[PDB]
Amino acid sequence: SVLNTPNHYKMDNSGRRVVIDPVTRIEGHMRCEVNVDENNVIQNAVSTGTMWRGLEVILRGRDPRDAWAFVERICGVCTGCHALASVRAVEDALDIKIPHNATLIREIMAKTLQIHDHIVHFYHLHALDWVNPVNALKADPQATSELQKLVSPHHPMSSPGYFKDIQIRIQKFVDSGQLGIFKNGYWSNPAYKLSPEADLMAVTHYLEALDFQKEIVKIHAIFGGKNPHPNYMVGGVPCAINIDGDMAAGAPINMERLNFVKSLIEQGRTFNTNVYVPDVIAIAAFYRDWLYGGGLSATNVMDYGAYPKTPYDKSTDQLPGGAIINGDWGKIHPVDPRDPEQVQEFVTHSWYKYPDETKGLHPWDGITEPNYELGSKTKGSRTNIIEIDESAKYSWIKSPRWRGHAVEVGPLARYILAYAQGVEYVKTQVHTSLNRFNAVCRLLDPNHKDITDLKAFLGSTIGRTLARALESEYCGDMMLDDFNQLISNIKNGDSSTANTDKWDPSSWPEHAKGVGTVAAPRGALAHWIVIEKGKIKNYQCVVPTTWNGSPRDPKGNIGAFEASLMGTPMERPDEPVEVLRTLHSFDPCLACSTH
Amino acid sequence: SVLNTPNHYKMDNSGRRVVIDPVTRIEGHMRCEVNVDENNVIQNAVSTGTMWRGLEVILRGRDPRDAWAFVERICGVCTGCHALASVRAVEDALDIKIPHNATLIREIMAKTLQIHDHIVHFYHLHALDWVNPVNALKADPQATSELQKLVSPHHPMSSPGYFKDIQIRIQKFVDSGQLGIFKNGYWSNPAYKLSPEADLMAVTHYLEALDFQKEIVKIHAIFGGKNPHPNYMVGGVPCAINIDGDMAAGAPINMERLNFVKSLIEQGRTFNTNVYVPDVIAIAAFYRDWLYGGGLSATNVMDYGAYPKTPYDKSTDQLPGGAIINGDWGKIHPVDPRDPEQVQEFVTHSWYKYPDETKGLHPWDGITEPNYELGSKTKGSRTNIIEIDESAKYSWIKSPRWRGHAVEVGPLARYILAYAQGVEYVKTQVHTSLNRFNAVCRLLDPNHKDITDLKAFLGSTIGRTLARALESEYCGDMMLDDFNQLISNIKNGDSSTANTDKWDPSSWPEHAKGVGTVAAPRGALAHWIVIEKGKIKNYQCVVPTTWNGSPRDPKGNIGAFEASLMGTPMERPDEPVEVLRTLHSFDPCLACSTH
Amino acid sequence: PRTPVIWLHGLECTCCSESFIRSAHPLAKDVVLSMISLDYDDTLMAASGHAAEAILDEIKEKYKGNYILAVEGNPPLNQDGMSCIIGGRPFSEQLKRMADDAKAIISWGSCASWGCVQAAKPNPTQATPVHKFLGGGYDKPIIKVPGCPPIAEVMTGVITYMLTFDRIPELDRQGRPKMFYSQRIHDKCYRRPHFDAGQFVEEWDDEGARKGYCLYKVGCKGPTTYNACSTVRWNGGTSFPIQSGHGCIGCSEDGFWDKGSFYSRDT
Amino acid sequence: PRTPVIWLHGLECTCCSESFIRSAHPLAKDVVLSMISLDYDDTLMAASGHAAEAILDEIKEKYKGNYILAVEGNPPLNQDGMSCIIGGRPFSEQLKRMADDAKAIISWGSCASWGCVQAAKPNPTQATPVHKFLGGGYDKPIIKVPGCPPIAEVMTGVITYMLTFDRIPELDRQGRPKMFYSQRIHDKCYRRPHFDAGQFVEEWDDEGARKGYCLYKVGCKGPTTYNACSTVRWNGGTSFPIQSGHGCIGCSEDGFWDKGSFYSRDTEMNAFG
Ligand code: SF4
Ligand code: SF4
Ligand code: F3S
Ligand code: F3S
Ligand SMILES: [C-]#N
Ligand SMILES: [C-]#N
Ligand SMILES: [C-]#N
Ligand SMILES: [C-]#N
Ligand SMILES: [Fe+2]
Ligand SMILES: [Fe+2]
Ligand SMILES: [Mg+2]
Ligand SMILES: [Mg+2]
Ligand code: NI
Ligand code: NI
Ligand SMILES: [O]
Ligand SMILES: [O]
């Protein structure tokens, strides 16, 4: 069949079908199927979420004050963001305002998560779509040092002998014949474009990032007890502050703990600027001629907006939200998560049931009733899917739409929205990164012509990857600002951390509804709660990867993942490096997507 | 006067007198006076220990089981070595044998101390005698990087931009006008011979070592609770082991704690090999023409011997002891700390009294009765010493002698003793170090003629400094061996850590005496205890700096410090860089010396 | 040769993999490069699709009876198992196949040990812990290492024990290593002096909260929860829930999601 | 400009300087380069002899009333003070002169706070803590930061507090910052559940030792000792004495060396005694 979607794609499944199940180097479980034409260009793509747990069902009847801990376990990668969304949703329902230190500590935890999550995504899940560790073994260590000095002159770790030592360790591993996580990788595919030296630099940095990442999450351990899965609470934060009073050493937050947080913040900022951001720029330059994967990013993007410099004043959001539609960056449509005409979820192509499956349901009206049922065109059986039938229900992921539009969410969405709204920090990052990109390009090709077209540059899998790194850097700077504000608050007399006026359910209205939003690492997150007589009557989550990984809607619009693969050529369709490189650029969180 | 000492020095105090009080960048308090001839050569040297506390007096009447904690507070720099000596002395007196794992853990703690102490001494105490941080501000960062890569090819930290960043930090500090610990340094004295690039490398490493040193002592925290001043006990170690039994997580030593010790050991080995040892070799090569300071190291050296591969078998000491006398490296005289004709302390030139001051007292017979009294030729007054009278009592340090001989103690003494006794690890270290030294020399002087004379090489202030660094490296390898032995013991069923058969004083003889020896960081340490009816009747310490810093004896022999300075030319007698450089090479511990 | 480990993922949040890589000692890089051979692991592995599947086939035959099967998450039994699909088939079939030729199983976390969040009422997918899915007749050790997630150094401490000492650690009656799970939080809790004195947090951010008083009256489940949080602590010994001011929620114990409100007192 | 600090050293073992440089956060490097101006400090300073003394003179003038005087160790009064000689004169004279124009004093460790080991019976040097040496009439704050040595992050935590919040921390009656010294070890000890159950180490390396039972019966002084060891802990939160199996010896408390044998059992344990 050849389907002409209202969002302007032609999904053609007559060519050769290629199945990727499992999709690895994601959180959770995904299947992807594509069809390629005679020229090995993707002409159909199918996103299937292959897990479901049912947290929305499990929450019914429970106490709103407990909900955060349940929903935190939607995801251990984006750990905490669902807790934040939950406590915000309850606070919204119950009209609880929290103390400024609680706002600040929650933002510090959120930015810690952003940094941790982005760094681990890029190195440990994405990089092997761009980096060939076997090829690293061919690198000249001196030339690797020269590259390193160009890529990031301030990073201290550049000795030829260091790169040689890393290479010796890799070589020993390969020589052992126990190739582990590298086993059967697609390393002979010409899709890999780094030089040996860049491959060695990037493997070196993979290991540096693995060592570093455990440090930054100590901020979560200080404020929230543990990482993964730090604690939150409705009305404040549990980490009470006592800097110089009786028994201060035994309070959660004291002078020593604050000094520790300062140290950890600075370490993160340094890794962002000296290791992560320079690497993404440099790798992008090696891949300067591979500008595939933009998908919807050029046309339709959305975020709820986050990080208001003034608590509770969204016009002060440092990552302002809204929706850009049909590629008009000059028009920011306001996004209201309360409006039943805006966010809606369809299940026409998902493994759920609605009474009227023609409807898209706003999440205060949402329904989660499982319906695992395969289309009569499936190749295979119910417990052995050979080729899924995307004409019918084909995913555990619901289909969210915004005013009927399919949109992309994530750091790239936020970066476009911020650029378009005049956020100068973001504009500077973009322009300086474009310039740095073109400088590396020129180093690689003195015949290079610079890239000036921001839409082409950002609206690509490379650009999606770059926006994530830039966002990490911005989050470190913001988190230092938050820390300094926390110290200022304390200095001026305010050590308060919780509002308990509405802790007791006897203070609650018999009926209430609320929504909490978060700029989660992968995009726009919100939780919608309906409370009745002290209990959860409905709890619906719509998560970033639900938006990006969405199956088709009743009108046939495709979602961000499917759109991003359309038109991409594959060197070797049976070695689908290009598909993995673009899907991974969305940082798919499949446990999130389905919850 | 001109005094012709029996150990062949001519002490001539007719030239100009130079006073250094305080001697800084030592532990504790010292005064040094010298006389220089018309050529600015030192022809007299006077070592004065300027503090006393009286630990030997304070211990009287107390319980032997408590002694370790009192004497540990002799010194916070060589923290724990006195505790080790004390428990050993008590165990000797009471005929206590401790479990193998206690032996091992005590040796692990001892080698941790060696590494920590040696590294902090070289960088934070000694280096400013060789390194000019103001001149570092003149360095070219790229040429600093080239030097670094030659000095230590494996160390990762060599980026030009890193050295430039360090240089910018030091420039900001200097430009502040608050020069702090660098204020009033003798930075224009031509005695400083590094290039700007070597100065910048060394300052960089000073900072790296300040960051590193706090890590290795976490081994003391794990086995001993804290650093400084970890805990010990008579009969074993308190850090009970439980790897996989009930409540293991709550035992002092469990699997996670062992894993932590492993990690710490390896970090220390790496820093020794990649930072500390290469720096001492390289600095030595810049100072290849400055071979002063050998003193007694050319003739008379001693250590009690340490680190037996077979517990309680000293023929297996990995740093074997003895005494070399009159420069005959072919004759190792056995040292017995029990023999009253061997170790003796005189007080003729010290601020103490004996009933018969002609006597040297073996420490089981020792007496510590203060007698602050200045000679009638003193310039100044009792509370304002302008020039001390070294013909009379001039120090809080007693005068220890071995069979009437003045000897040098310390890492250099141990290295000469080990070399001479065929310890292949040491012979290899010495030969490889000589080879590396000559290679760095030829880098600096392409017409360099190799040094081949080991006596001349080792027998100098440079050699003393090198031996300390080599010892650090050896201690790291030995500690790894010890850890692996501990693991093997546990694996084979032995998790035991204490012997309590003689814990109760009722099990003790009415009268007992013991001696405990240690290879302390600075040399030969021993404690001698006499027990009577449960209580300390006498407790006498003779510590490494007591030997090295000794004042003259009744026959006029000079000690190691005074000897080391004789014959040294000074560029600027009133900016006495050379005196500090040589005294600091002994790593004087003045609180230890006087206790 | 390094011990082969196959790390399977069922219904999960991936918090157990994430915790593992936090290990301070040994470092995850060193575990993977030098201690074990991590032969299959969805989260970090290069291979996907058919190429991934082929490793399982190869490791199974090649190292039959000689690999450790580590399991994160759990198998669902509802939806014909297709609430967790891997390679077009139920995860339960993958788990069974690999379990059949494992030397031993490690059940990471509360998901694989007990069921965790997806098994909380009404358990829509009939998510089932590994030992119950394999049943009583399973003849190889199942090491339960519970917690949501477990402490990083507990995870790597179990592995280093096995590798260093060449045996399964001693287990309690619930299959948990006595190395880490043989005391309750409350049996080693530094706020116990306050519990003993009747000194409690009564309301968030009260005087007691600011002094570090006991969290019993705000719902701490430490009295009934076996784990190493109060001894080893979290994230390189930085903190644990109670240190940072929130009671234990019981996250290493079977059924903790359905024990009542986290803020209701332990009984 | 950075707060001037003069760090003097009396009779001492140097454990307090050593502890200070162990600080995990802030790092010692950063304290010295960026937070304070460490203008005099025997252990680390470039200058010696007459050039060192001249720094005293200058700072004292230039920053009169504006430097913090930190003191490690203590002055002896016996031997005409010449059991601790600095520049040929008694250390007590140095201490007095610099105290006269300090803004505030930090008494580091048990030596400066209380007397520590050299003041244990029979105190041959008449070693005297700073506050007693300067007497009742001294009109500037003396912040006691006791322990042998204090915890590193406590030492740097006091300094960062003062620099960040622009005030002396609140002190208890003994002059110790409530930040760190306002609980006993035993008020926050993770072995307390065992104490409460009567589960003790009775002999070294017994069953209880291997399970982490309470150390009371082997002499732990945690019931009478005020410090942050059971909360902040030591060496970047790695351990503390009790965790590693030896009781507290009381090392932050006045007179701990003469309180009794370290293996004697602690007193005042019953509310009916
Ligand atoms: S109830 Fe919780 S906070 Fe209180 S002592 Fe027990 S484990 Fe600690
Ligand atoms: S006596 Fe010591 S070990 Fe026992 S609970 Fe008190 S402080 Fe802890
Ligand atoms: S909630 Fe879990 S992490 Fe530990 S403190 Fe309680 S068992
Ligand atoms: S001996 Fe000192 S270090 Fe702490 S635990 Fe006791 S106050
Ligand atoms: C999810 N981010
Ligand atoms: C998350 N997505
Ligand atoms: C001391 N050595
Ligand atoms: C120590 N001498
Ligand atoms: Fe997510
Ligand atoms: Fe010493
Ligand atoms: Mg949902
Ligand atoms: Mg003596
Ligand atoms: Ni997620
Ligand atoms: Ni010493
Ligand atoms: O997720
Ligand atoms: O010392």
Side-chain angles (χ1 to χ4, degrees), chain D residues 220-273:
Chain D
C220 186
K221 304 294 149 15
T224 53
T225 302
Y226 288 83
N227 207 339
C229 311
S230 55
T231 42
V232 177
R233 307 186 308 291
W234 278 81
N235 298 287
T238 296
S239 203
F240 71 116
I242 289 144
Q243 179 174 350
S244 294
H246 197 286
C248 177
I249 70 173
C251 82
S252 58
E253 294 295 317
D254 187 18
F256 74 95
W257 295 104
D258 288 311
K259 189 269 190 71
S261 172
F262 298 129
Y263 306 105
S264 68
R265 297 173 188 161
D266 208 1
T267 51
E268 291 101 7
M269 298 302 291
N270 312 307
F272 50 75

Side-chain angles (χ1 to χ4, degrees), chain B residues 495-514:
Chain B
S495 289
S496 70
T497 48
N499 167 150
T500 59
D501 310 4
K502 296 262 198 116
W503 177 256
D504 194 280
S506 68
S507 68
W508 307 352
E510 181 181 318
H511 303 278
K513 69 188 185 192

Side-chain angles (χ1 to χ4, degrees), chain C residues 186-190 192-194 196 211-212 233 237, chain D residues 186-190 192-194 196 211-212 233 237:
Chain C
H186 184 80
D187 292 333
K188 286 299 219 295
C189 185
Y190 83 106
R192 183 64 177 267
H194 297 300
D196 293 340
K211 294 179 168 178
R233 311 186 308 292
Chain D
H186 183 76
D187 291 332
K188 288 297 214 301
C189 185
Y190 84 105
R192 184 68 173 264
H194 298 301
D196 293 342
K211 290 179 176 186
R233 307 186 308 291

Side-chain angles (χ1 to χ4, degrees), chain A residues 384-464:
Chain A
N384 179 34
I385 307 174
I386 302 165
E387 294 176 19
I388 211 161
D389 179 6
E390 68 277 19
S391 76
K393 300 170 171 289
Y394 67 87
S395 186
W396 286 109
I397 306 174
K398 296 187 177 165
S399 299
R401 299 288 182 271
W402 180 84
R403 297 194 180 279
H405 300 277
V407 307
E408 172 167 330
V409 302
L412 178 52
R414 286 186 288 255
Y415 265 62
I416 290 168
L417 286 160
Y419 190 98
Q421 290 181 93
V423 178
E424 290 299 340
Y425 181 107
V426 166
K427 292 183 71 185
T428 294
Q429 281 186 302
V430 168
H431 279 111
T432 60
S433 303
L434 181 58
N435 293 345
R436 288 162 75 181
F437 164 92
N438 289 129
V440 182
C441 280
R442 184 71 62 11
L443 275 15
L444 301 167
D445 172 10
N447 300 138
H448 186 243
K449 184 125 162 277
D450 286 353
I451 283 193
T452 58
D453 184 345
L454 247 224
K455 283 185 175 179
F457 185 65
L458 294 176
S460 70
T461 287
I462 284 173
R464 193 176 297 105

